[PDB]
Amino acid sequence: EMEKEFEQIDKSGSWAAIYQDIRHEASDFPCRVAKLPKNKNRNRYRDVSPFDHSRIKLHQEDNDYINASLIKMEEAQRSYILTQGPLPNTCGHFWEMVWEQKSRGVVMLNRVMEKGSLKCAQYWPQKEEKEMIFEDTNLKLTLISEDIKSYYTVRQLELENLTTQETREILHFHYTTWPDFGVPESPASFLNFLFKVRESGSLSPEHGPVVVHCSAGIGRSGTFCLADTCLLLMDKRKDPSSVDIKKVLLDMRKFRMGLIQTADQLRFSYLAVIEGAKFIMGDSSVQDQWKELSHED
Numbered sequence: 054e055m056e057k058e059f060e061q062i063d064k065s066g067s068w069a070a071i072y073q074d075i076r077h078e079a080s081d082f083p084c085r086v087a088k089l090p091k092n093k094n095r096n097r098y099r100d101v102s103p104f105d106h107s108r109i110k111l112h113q114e115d116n117d118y119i120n121a122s123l124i125k126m127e128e129a130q131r132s133y134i135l136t137q138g139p140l141p142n143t144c145g146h147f148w149e150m151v152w153e154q155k156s157r158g159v160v161m162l163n164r165v166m167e168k169g170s171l172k173c174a175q176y177w178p179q180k181e182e183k184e185m186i187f188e189d190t191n192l193k194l195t196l197i198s199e200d201i202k203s204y205y206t207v208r209q210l211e212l213e214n215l216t217t218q219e220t221r222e223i224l225h226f227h228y229t230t231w232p233d234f235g236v237p238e239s240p241a242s243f244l245n246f247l248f249k250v251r252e253s254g255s256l257s258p259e260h261g262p263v264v265v266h267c268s269a270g271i272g273r274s275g276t277f278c279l280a281d282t283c284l285l286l287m288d289k290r291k292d293p294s295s296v297d298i299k300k301v302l303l304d305m306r307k308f309r310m311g312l313i314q315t316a317d318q319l320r321f322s323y324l325a326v327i328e329g330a331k332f333i334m335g336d337s338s339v340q341d342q343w344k345e346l347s348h349e350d
């Protein structure tokens with residue numbers, strides 16, 4: 054269905070129509086907490102807010118608000134936290150969330166600067182010797198090491214709760230070649246990256262939800278999560294035909310608005326999943342193929 058639908062939608066050039074229908078059917082819930090006057094400076098974008106029912110609450114005294122949503126996929130049995138690229142004043146909140154939610158990995162799909170503008174604060178240390186201390190949330194962050202690839206970087210960070218002195222290892226998966234409102238260079242480079250996150254164990258149910266973000270936390274982030282969830286469902290059932298991508302996307306949209314921002318990102322989601330199915334169903338040789346095609350070295 055997904056593959057016959059793809060060639061079909063593609064033979065009639067109606068991706069914009071298909072995408073817009075999803076937008077029209079998308080859920081609409083209130084974001085009153087996000088719209089409160091006191092939270093205006095905690096939002097990067099006026100028109101991108103987390104619904105109240107699924108927002109992540111900071112276990113905080115003063116203000117529990119952060120622009121982040123818990124995408125809880127009941128059937129797939131995996132959860133993700135999609136959030137905006139933290140602001141200069143919310144980096145402490147960002148790491149507090151990571152700590153309280155017990156996340157093991159953080160997936161970043163954007164670059165700090167895109168099109169001459171700052172789409173995300175430098176929330177992690179770029180140098181081992183220069184660790185970061187977030188005074189407001191009493192947290193300390195240290196870069197332990199990093200493995201730089203051609204189009205993505207994986208970092209090992211140590212997050213410490215200065216209050217209790219406990220420490221945890223956080224893995225940072227940074228995709229540096231995914232244009233804003235754009236799509237990855239190829240399904241291969243994307244899957245190669247997705248599988249790296251999977252192999253790390255960061256998506257395991259034994260950990261808290263992986264934190265995923267781009268600039269707004271809905272376009273590139275939504276694409277990443279949709280593809281992952283679809284492959285997971287398919288994997289659980291070992292049946293590619295039982296996956297209704299559009300349905301999954303609509304379910305995800307019940308938890309955060311605007312997931313997947315362009316018709317091409319949706320189209321790319323299909324490509325990624327269709328190609329990923331090969332591995333899921335037993336052709337693991339393809340994993341090595343993506344690695345080659347991605348040109349990561």
Ligand SMILES: O=C1CN(c2csc(-c3ccccc3)c2Cl)S(=O)(=O)N1
Pocket residue numbers: 098099100101163232233234235267268269270271272273274311314
């Ligand atoms: O592919 C994308 C595009 N992204 C966006 C950047 S500004 C933006 C936006 C800001 C304000 C109003 C409407 C839309 C969105 Cl949406 S994202 O960083 O969520 N991933």
